[PDB]
């Protein structure tokens, strides 16, 4: 279910865009403490996700610095790729102006729009725009935000699924680390292990007795 053409036209009007927002690129900045910030970039082409074109950028740093992270990704990405019709940033006035300053710095020009993180406030050209809750343009920006969040969050469902599975396996009395790891590597997640027969789980670890305790905990 895409961004409605009518709402895209209303966005164009709200932002005083010359061109229709045919290509919209959206950025989320998320930080892993003591490791790096991951920027996730989504792409909409006439209101539908263009999943092949989705990208991430990593900024190595122990502590977050979201405005610097945005500045870095704008510069890295748009020194190689063409500008879209519109850039969306998951954040407020600070994150938007960071994107704009970075674009100036590389001699490029593209409209940038944000939605403030807490409220559903639209941010554009150093101003907040407070639309009514049901306003079509707000609903459209929330959709972009929801997809940008979904893609950001997928950066490790795998390692999170495995951690979640382990968390549950830790409640199985007397399984021990080696068999625990065997189950995690074979199944990968709770969804998979919960789909499995007693006989499969028992084959993975070499013990039906323990496999029964696994099923008990699930
Ligand atoms: Mn169309
Ligand atoms: Mn988010």
């Amino acid at each position: 279910r895409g961004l409605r053409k009518e709402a895209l036209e209303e966005l164009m009007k709200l932002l005083n865009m010359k061109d229709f927002p045919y290509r919209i690129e959206g950025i989320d900045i998320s930080h892993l403490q003591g490791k790096y910030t991951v920027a996730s970039l989504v792409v909409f082409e006439d209101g539908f996700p263009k999943k092949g074109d989705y990208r991430r950028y990593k900024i190595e740093q122990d502590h977050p610095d979201d405005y610097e992270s945005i500045r870095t990704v704008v510069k890295r990405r748009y020194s190689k790729h063409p500008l879209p019709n519109l850039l969306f940033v998951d954040g407020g006035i600070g994150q938007v102006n960071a994107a704009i300053e970075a674009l100036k710095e590389i001699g490029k020009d593209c409209p940038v729009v944000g939605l403030a993180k807490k409220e559903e406030t639209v941010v554009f050209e150093n101003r907040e725009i407070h639309l009514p809750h049901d306003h079509p343009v707000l609903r459209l920006l929330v959709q972009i935000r929801d997809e940008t969040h979904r893609f950001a969050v997928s950066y490790h469902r795998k390692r999170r699924e495995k951690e979640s599975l382990r968390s549950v396996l830790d409640n199985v009395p007397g399984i021990g680390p080696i068999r625990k790891k065997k189950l995690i590597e074979h199944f990968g997640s709770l969804e998979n292990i919960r789909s499995a027969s007693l006989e499969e789980i028992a084959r993975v670890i070499g013990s039906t007795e323990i496999a029964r305790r696994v099923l008990d905990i699930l």
Side-chain angles (χ1 to χ4, degrees), residues 2-159 161-218:
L3 314 183
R4 314 180 344 242
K5 177 168 168 171
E6 315 91 77
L8 283 166
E9 296 169 343
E10 291 189 59
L11 180 68
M12 194 186 164
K13 188 183 171 164
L14 186 75
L15 301 190
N16 296 129
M17 287 175 60
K18 161 169 109 54
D19 290 328
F20 178 86
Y22 185 81
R23 194 175 176 101
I24 296 169
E25 291 178 0
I27 296 157
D28 163 278
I29 300 303
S30 294
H31 185 77
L32 299 159
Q33 184 58 32
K35 302 198 81 204
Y36 50 81
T37 291
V38 182
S40 294
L41 192 123
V42 307
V43 177
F44 282 81
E45 172 184 272
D46 216 353
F48 282 90
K50 192 152 188 192
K51 300 256 217 261
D53 276 12
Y54 281 24
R55 291 299 177 270
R56 311 184 195 269
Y57 302 88
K58 307 204 297 106
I59 305 85
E60 284 180 306
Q61 55 200 6
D62 291 348
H63 297 103
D65 187 346
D66 288 359
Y67 304 167
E68 274 298 304
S69 296
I70 297 271
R71 162 173 178 231
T72 296
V73 333
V74 165
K75 277 167 106 166
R76 276 184 203 171
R77 179 160 179 89
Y78 301 114
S79 70
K80 168 181 187 219
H81 296 255
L83 282 164
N85 299 109
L86 180 60
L87 179 63
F88 172 84
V89 183
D90 176 52
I93 284 154
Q95 289 212 15
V96 168
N97 288 359
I100 290 164
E101 293 165 12
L103 289 162
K104 307 223 266 275
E105 179 160 26
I106 61 171
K108 308 286 176 80
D109 188 308
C110 171
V112 185
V113 66
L115 253 197
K117 276 196 204 313
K118 308 290 270 287
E119 303 227 315
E120 277 172 1
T121 298
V122 180
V123 163
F124 189 61
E125 296 186 335
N126 208 35
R127 290 169 298 82
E128 299 183 309
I129 303 161
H130 298 265
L131 297 171
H133 152 252
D134 20 33
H135 192 281
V137 169
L138 190 48
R139 295 340 303 159
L140 179 152
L141 298 167
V142 175
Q143 281 183 282
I144 295 172
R145 175 175 86 190
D146 289 358
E147 178 64 10
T148 311
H149 176 87
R150 197 217 61 171
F151 183 53
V153 164
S154 73
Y155 179 66
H156 303 127
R157 70 187 273 181
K158 257 193 202 156
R159 300 182 138 179
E161 279 179 348
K162 267 162 158 44
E163 294 181 327
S164 289
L165 172 57
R166 166 158 288 169
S167 185
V168 170
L169 294 181
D170 292 336
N171 292 306
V172 183
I175 176 161
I178 295 150
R179 288 171 150 156
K180 211 182 282 186
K181 190 161 279 159
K182 285 192 188 173
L183 288 167
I184 292 162
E185 292 302 304
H186 182 95
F187 290 108
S189 67
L190 291 160
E191 175 166 278
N192 294 335
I193 194 166
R194 289 193 167 111
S195 83
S197 68
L198 176 71
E199 282 86 8
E200 171 172 14
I201 294 167
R203 278 188 275 274
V204 175
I205 57 174
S207 174
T208 305
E209 203 84 343
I210 300 172
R212 295 182 191 284
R213 297 210 296 281
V214 174
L215 291 190
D216 275 331
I217 273 45
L218 292 174

